[PDB]
Each structure stands twice: as structure tokens, then as C-alpha cells.
Design a protein around this ligand. Structure first.
Ligand SMILES: [Zn+2]
Length: 29
């Protein structure tokens, strides 16, 4: 498998992108 659920950008917490592209500076957008 890949990682349990989709890559919800562990750097932000949203399903759709990876922290490598996390455009959310923790609580902001
Ligand atoms: Zn993100």
C-alpha cells in the first residue's frame, strides 16, 4: 500500500496534496 489513507499533507492535514507542496503554513489557508 502507500500510507493508510491518502497523503493528507501531514504538514497541514488535508487530503489532496503532500507536505512537499503544503501551501498551508499550519493554520492559515
Ligand atoms: Zn498542505
Amino acid at each position: 500500500a502507500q500510507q493508510r489513507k491518502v497523503i493528507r499533507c501531514w504538514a497541514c492535514g488535508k487530503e489532496g496534496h503532500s507536505a512537499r507542496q503544503c501551501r498551508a503554513p499550519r493554520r492559515q489557508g
